[PDB]
Each structure stands twice: as structure tokens, then as C-alpha cells.
Amino acid sequence: NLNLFATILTYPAPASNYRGESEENRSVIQKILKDGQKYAIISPESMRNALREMLIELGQPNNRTRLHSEDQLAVEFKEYPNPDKFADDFLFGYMVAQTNDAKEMKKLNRPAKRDSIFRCNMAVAVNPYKYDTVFYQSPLNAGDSAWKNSTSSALLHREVTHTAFQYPFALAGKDCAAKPEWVKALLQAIAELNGVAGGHARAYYEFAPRSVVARLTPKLVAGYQTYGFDAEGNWLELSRLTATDSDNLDLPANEFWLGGELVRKMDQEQKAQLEAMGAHLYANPEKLFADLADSFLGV
């Protein structure tokens, strides 16, 4: 009741996510895994920025905001960040400093914020990469030389993959005075996040709802999960033996896990069997979050 864990996957779709750079005119993709194949990944700070943007989307005061200016990537700083900020600074982010003024701005707050309340890891494509590409391009040239771009009309390439990927996250319950109001918004935003990519004019897809495996127990951060699903998308095979035996055999409890969308798989008899112990009842993740945020919280 003091910790919350989850891993979330998505729907299958093509993904561009042009990140790398190449003189050979091919926007390469990031590969991290070594099993004889390559996998596509997502940097966590990308979804961090998306979460910041949707904290902006709902009414939530902030100190950080992106502006468009000279080519140096700049972000407007607004008021000086304080731990008693409403949405962004308190929830995550550090107040780095070089001079840190005088006597810690007259002993106001503290220049050391521990870390983000919630911690996330990078995503894994869980589908092998293939060398396919798209000859999607033919830049042209200006006609009247008015605001003309580069002189020549060159050729280049791009590549995409049809893939669905998952990512884990977790958090610990420390504060309950001011934390609940912004934790509700955090959970609502987590239930539906959009972006986390450079190209949305082309190769648009959204990836929040596919399944939830949430957990909340006073074990102080214990993980029986491997943070991995299969291609067909169900991982209950190794955990079906674990789900039962709630009363005895020292096995993970009944109100230890939560359901998702995989519960709507075809067969139902064993779903009814598992219903007696565990809380695998919610088919829509957005409804599941509205209840389990209350359950995890004080109210």
C-alpha cells in the first residue's frame, strides 16, 4: 500500500522515431540488445517531456516551458523552481546551480531535490529489427529564388518498423498531504500519453492503452516480474501457477496484482476461477486507474 508498480505495452503499428544522424542520408534507429538481432528503443526523457506537456495540458502550474527561438535549444525558466511547486518541480526535476547565490537564497527551500517521485526505464521493441526502408523522398528547388533553400535537389532514405513495445515504471508512497492532487493527474496522464517522437506529421500512432499488470503491496519494492511479454501479448503462462494459491503455499497474494485488456481473451472458465482470489475485473485500463489510484492513495 506504499508502492506502485506497472509495465505497459501498446498496439501494433509502424514507428519512424528518427533519432540518429548519418552522412549516408538514412535516419538510423537506436539498437541496444544483443541476441543476434537489433531492437528499437525509446529514451525515458522523451516520455518525461510528454508527461510535462500533458501536465501543461490540464490545469497545472509549472516553472518549465518550451519556447521557439534561435537554433540553440532553449527552454524558458519562468520563476525560480521550488520544491513547493505545484506540478513539475515537486514531482520531478532538480534545481542544479553553479553559484547558488548567497546563503541558499536566504535559506529558501534547498538546492537538492532527491529525484523524480516516479522512476521509469527505457522501452524495448520486443520484435526483431529488419533492414527495410522507404524511398519516401524527393526534395525540390525554389523557382523564383525568393527565400530559396539549398541549391540542389538531392535524394535520401528513411526506414520504419512494424512493432509494438512496452516499458516499466514504479513509484513509492511517501507524501500524502499535497501529493494526492497531482498524483491523480499523473495517473490520468499515464492512462493516456501521446507523442514521444519527432515525426507526427508522418507515421502517427498512439500507444498508451494495451494492458496493465499493476501491483501495490507493502513489500518495499519487490519484483516477481521480468518486465517482458510475448509476441501474442500474454505473459500469464509462467505467472498462472503464481496467481493461484492465495491462501497458502507462501505464494503472491490475491489482491497483489490487477487486470487489464488481456482478460478479454476468449476463454472464461479459468477467468472465473481466478476471479475468486485476484482483482482481475477491469477491462478498460482508464477505469482501472481511476479505482486503483484511490486504493493506493489514502482515499
Partner 1 sequence: TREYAEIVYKIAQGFVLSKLSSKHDLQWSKCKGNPKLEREYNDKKEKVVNEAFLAIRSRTEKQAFIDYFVSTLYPHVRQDEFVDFAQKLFQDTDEIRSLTLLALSSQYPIK
Partner DNA sequence: ACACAAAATATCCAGATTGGGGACACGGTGATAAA
Partner DNA sequence: CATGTGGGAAA
Q: Give the whole-angstrom CA distance, residue 66 versus residue 78.
A: 11
With a CB cutoff of 8 Å and minimum separation 6, the contacts of 138 are: 153, 155
- In this structure, what are the phi and psi dihedrals at residue 180, rounded to the nearest 5 degrees? -55, -40
**Residue 102, interface with a copy of itself (CB under 8 A)?**
no
Q: Is 253 in the site for a copy of itself (CB under 8 A)?
A: no
> Of a copy of itself, partner 1, DNA, none, which one does residue 203 interact with (CB within 5 to 8 Å by kind)?
a copy of itself
Is the separation of the CB atoms in 16 and 98 below 8 Å? no
Using CB under 8 A as the binding rule, the residues of this chain from 98 to 137 that contact partner 1 are 131, 133
Q: Are 25 and 19 in contact (CB under 8 A)?
A: no
Residues 256-275 that bind a copy of itself (CB under 8 A): 264
Cell numbers found for residue 200: 507526427
Q: For residues 33 and 46, what is the distance between their CA atoms, to the nearest angstrom?
A: 20
Q: Does 242 bind partner 1 (CB under 8 A)?
A: no
Residues in contact with DNA by CB under 7 A are: 23-25, 27, 71-73, 96, 98, 135, 137-139, 149-150, 152-156
Interface residue with a copy of itself, options 1, 37, 45, 176 (CB under 8 A): 45
Q: Does 84 interact with partner 1 (rule: CB under 8 A)?
A: no
217, interface contact from a copy of itself, DNA, partner 1, none, CB < 5-8 Å by kind? none
x/- contact string, 59-98, with a copy of itself (CB under 8 A)? --------xxx--xxxxxxxxxx----------x--xxxx
The Cβ of residue 27 has, within 10 Å, a number of other Cβ atoms equal to 17
Residues numbered 160 to 199 that lie near a copy of itself (CB under 8 A) are 160-162, 168-170, 192, 194
Residue 158 found at the interface with partner 1 (CB under 8 A): no
**Is 282 exposed, middle or buried (CB count within 10 Å of its CB: 0-12, 13-18, 19+)?**
buried
